[PDB]
Design an enzyme around this catalytic site. Sequence first.
Site, short mmCIF file in Angstrom:
data_model
loop_
_atom_site.label_atom_id
_atom_site.label_comp_id
_atom_site.label_asym_id
_atom_site.label_seq_id
_atom_site.Cartn_x
_atom_site.Cartn_y
_atom_site.Cartn_z
N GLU A 121 62.40 34.49 24.89
CA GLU A 121 61.77 33.48 23.91
C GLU A 121 62.57 32.54 23.41
OE1 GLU A 121 58.69 35.21 21.48
OE2 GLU A 121 57.79 36.41 23.15
N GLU A 148 54.97 41.18 31.18
CA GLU A 148 53.97 41.69 30.03
C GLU A 148 52.49 41.29 30.35
OE1 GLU A 148 55.63 40.26 26.25
OE2 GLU A 148 57.70 40.53 26.97
#
Length: 354
Positions: free
Chosen positions: A149, A259
């Site tokens: 991220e 994910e």
Amino acid sequence: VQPFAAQVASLADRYEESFDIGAAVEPHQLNGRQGKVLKHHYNSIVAENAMKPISLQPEEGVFTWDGADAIVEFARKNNMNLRFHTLVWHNQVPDWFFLDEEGNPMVEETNEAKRQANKELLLERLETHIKTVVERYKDDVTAWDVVNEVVDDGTPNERGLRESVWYQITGDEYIRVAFETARKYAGEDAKLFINDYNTEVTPKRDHLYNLVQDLLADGVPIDGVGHQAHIQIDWPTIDEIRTSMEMFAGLGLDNQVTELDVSLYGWPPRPAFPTYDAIPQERFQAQADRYNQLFELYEELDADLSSVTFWGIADNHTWLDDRAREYNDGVGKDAPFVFDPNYRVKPAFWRIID
Ligand SMILES: [Mg+2]
Ligand code: NA
């Protein structure tokens, strides 16, 4: 009533020519009914929480390995691949990283020379964390989320880099140092990933593309892009997903889906059904069609896609419930997987096993 997961065809075997089929796990799930579902259907796992930075080095020099070790042991015993999540992130990361030698936050420093010294100290700390973790797990891990991220959802600077504490203290250098450090200690064959959410939509997608182009141009070792794929039924489009994977494959990068979950809701997730029981059949059907199209796309793209991990096993355990409860007065249930809370199959299972 739908059959139990252990009575249907293994997902991993169904996809063995294309990609791994993985699940995010916690140490307490590695026995009982989850244990059984895992062994039956999956050939890869990742730690939902136990390998994040705060889970491994909560104080400097103090490493807590047990949850992570239990996950590695389970993978090895059951002949599963293992993704490492994650070396570098701005959450679930210990505060002590970012304190100067006198105990004050490094971001507060105004003297340029002390700031340079802080940058070098943080980078050295990052390197020590990576070196120690990679030395322990290099013979087990088959894919590293080296950074997580690091790209922004908007454009606060021209490169679209997330202005977390890592960026505030080091600019982009933490990213270079994390990849180089991981390559150095894991060896040449280790697979290094940059992981992120909303890799399918602009401008984030393009900022990530530009970042990987830049780092590849400097000889920074990056092997692929991790697409979290926290997605919805209608969003992003199949074509948005396709385009993003093709773009990265265009730079000679691998893709992994890391994910995956298919929420029953929009963003934010309201209104949400209050119980699983309250969810109507139409939600499960629309999810199933969505999953069909996803997995047909993943198969079409399988030269450039090595692994598809779901962010959980069955609908009894998902962080989307935390999000549903957050935006609906502490009451709400999502249902993102192909396996229901009792470990019975859902309509989506049939649409991805065929
Ligand atoms: Mg299908
Ligand atoms: Na593949």
